[PDB]
Amino acid sequence: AWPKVQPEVNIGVVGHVDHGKTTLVQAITGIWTSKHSEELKRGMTIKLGYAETNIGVCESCKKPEAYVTEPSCKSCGSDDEPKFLRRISFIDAPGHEVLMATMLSGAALMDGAILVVAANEPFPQPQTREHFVALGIIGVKNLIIVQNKVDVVSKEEALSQYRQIKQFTKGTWAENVPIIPVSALHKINIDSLIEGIEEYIKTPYRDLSQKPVMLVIRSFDVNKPGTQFNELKGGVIGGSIIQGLFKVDQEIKVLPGLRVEKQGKVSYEPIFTKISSIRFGDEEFKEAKPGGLVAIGTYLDPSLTKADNLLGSIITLADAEVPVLWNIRIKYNLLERVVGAKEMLKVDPIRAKETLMLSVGSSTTLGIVTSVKKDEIEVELRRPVAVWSNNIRTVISRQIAGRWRMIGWGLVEI
């Protein structure tokens, strides 16, 4: 039989627009990501397209048709349970995305991604061009492009566009990202896509002994109304554990933690508690490894987690040693120009004393530059950040126009 495991990789599905990639996940998995009642029935995630699947292969059958997301090979005249390969998860932002300071999170929670482009529209649309650029800044690796809606266009018109795409990736990091053509609506060529995810978005190497760290992307008071006081449950933390391993019953802390205002002056107190449960989807486990979105029960005053109070923090083992710097040094690489408004605008170098909005892990906190050099800048943060590792990639964003737009990335120095 196939196992009851947690997902081991997160794949971000970055689409052009609407439910034309909400149904692509829905097609690979069979459980709509936008407006999924899986948030009501174990799976609370706002704005989150979070769905998972098991991936197997019928050894007895030919590829790509040999891949299955189900324990069955009937698809190809075989009653042999197929081989299980892994369980994966997809993440994507609903319809007119809104992936401004939300997509930046995917940076940490994304072992690879999928950029879906409409095959019956001119390539590359505006949104597509920039989506492309955001994946460079995010530093996302494994990428696959998907020509959606190819059954609505001629093999030649489909092939023609293919060319433009390859002629766009020509020169950039995605020089050779594969382009897989499908039809998410009427399910055309979905097998090749599963074979593609298997070949191009392999699960990255994991060191299960590394300092356990988890990025909290959601948190809340799981209790319902009318609950009798002596029957309440501790706050629940939702997020993706990045490195390390977390077992139920461990002593953990939350960084930066709880904001304190004593003596008129603002300070942060790390929040300690213990793990009461680990849950990946509908299934409860005992260990949480990097892989999908995990819901963690705690002994925290629900009042501390209610309405994502903790979003942006990071969970680490109680004893871990993680600094939280109100001031950080960054080895950056700015962007030449950024598309927007009329024609693809130019980026001004880092001005001293200007306000930037940087994002470490799942925390985008803005600060003030205090020092500027060719490769390094020093920023005075509005809120402290927990620097769990040394070269934690950061995304620098300036408010060009009225929108906070990405102007480059950088590595945090310590």
**19 in a known ligand binding site:** yes
Instruction: Give the torsion sign (CA, 293, 297, 298, 302).
Output: positive
Q: Which two tokens stand for residue 305?
A: 């987690």
Header resolution in angstroms:
2.9
Burial class (CB in 10 A: 0-12, 13-18, 19+), 175: exposed
CA dist., res. 257 & res. 219, Å (int): 13
**102 in a known ligand binding site:** no
CA dist., res. 127 & res. 125, Å (int): 6
Q: State the Cα torsion 173-8-281-79 to the nearest 10°.
A: 110
How open is the CA angle 82-109-192, to the nearest 5 degrees? 35
Which pairs with CB-CB distance under 8 Å and at least 24 residues apart come from 120-128? 120/149, 120/152, 120/153, 121/16, 123/161, 123/164, 123/165, 123/168, 124/164, 124/165, 124/168, 125/16, 126/339, 127/16, 127/17, 127/97, 128/16
**151 in a known ligand binding site:** yes
Would you say 300 and 27 are in contact if contact means Cβ atoms under 8 Å apart? no
CATH class held by domain 207-321: mainly beta
**185 in a known ligand binding site:** yes
Burial class (CB in 10 A: 0-12, 13-18, 19+), 331: middle
Phi-psi region of 93 (alpha: psi -120 to 50; beta: other; left: phi over 0): beta
Strand partners, 412: 330
**148 in a known ligand binding site:** yes
**183 in a known ligand binding site:** yes
CA dist., res. 24 & res. 45, Å (int): 19
CA dist., res. 201 & res. 178, Å (int): 11
So where are the chain's domains?
1-206, 207-321, 322-414
**244 in a known ligand binding site:** no
**107 in a known ligand binding site:** no
Cis peptide before 256 (omega within 30 of 0): yes
How open is the CA angle 224-29-31, to the nearest 5 degrees? 35
CA dist., res. 204 & res. 88, Å (int): 12
**58 in a known ligand binding site:** yes
Residue-wise burial string across 244-262, b where 16 or more C-beta atoms lie within 10 A, e elsewhere:
bbbebeeebbbbbbeeeee
Amino acid at 313: S
Cis peptide before 349 (omega within 30 of 0): no
CATH class held by domain 322-414: mainly beta
Strand partners, 13: 114
CA dist., res. 184 & res. 188, Å (int): 7
**297 in a known ligand binding site:** no
CA dist., res. 58 & res. 68, Å (int): 7
Amino acid at 412: V
The total of other beta-carbon atoms located within 10 Å of residue 124's CB is 19
**150 in a known ligand binding site:** yes
**136 in a known ligand binding site:** no
> HEC string of the chain?
CCCCCCCCEEEEEEECCCCCCCCCHHHHHCCCCCCCCCCCCCCCCCCCEEEEEEEEECCCCCCCCCEECCCCCHHHCCCCCCEEEEEEEEEECCCCCCCCCCHHHHCCCCCEEEEEEECCCCCCCHHHHHHHHHHHHCCCCCEEEEEECHHHCCHHHHHHHHHHHHCCCCCCHHHHCCEEECECCCCECHHHHHHHHHHHCCCCCCCCCCCCEEEEEEEECCCCCCCCHHHCCCCEEEEEEEECCEECCCEEEEEEEEEECHHHCCEEEEEEEECCEEEECCEEECEECECECEEEECCCCHHHCCCCCCCCCEEEECCCCCCEEEEEEEEEEECCEECCCCCCEECCCCCCCCEEEEEECCEEEEEEEEEECCCEEEEEEEEEEECCCCCCEEEEEECCCCCCEEEEEEEEEC
| Radius of gyration over every alpha carbon of the chain, rounded to an integer in angstroms | 22
Q: CB within 8 A of 18, min separation 6: which ones?
A: 95, 96
- 1-206: CATH number: 3.40.50.300
Q: Which two tokens stand for residue 225?
A: 């109304």
Q: Which two tokens stand for residue 30?
A: 């069979």
Would you say 329 and 376 are in contact if contact means Cβ atoms under 8 Å apart? yes
How long is the chain?
414
**18 in a known ligand binding site:** yes
Common-topology check for domains 1-206 and 207-321: no
Q: State the Cα torsion 303-306-308-310 to the nearest 10°.
A: 20
Which of 352, 383, 351 lies closest to 367, judged by CA?
A: 383
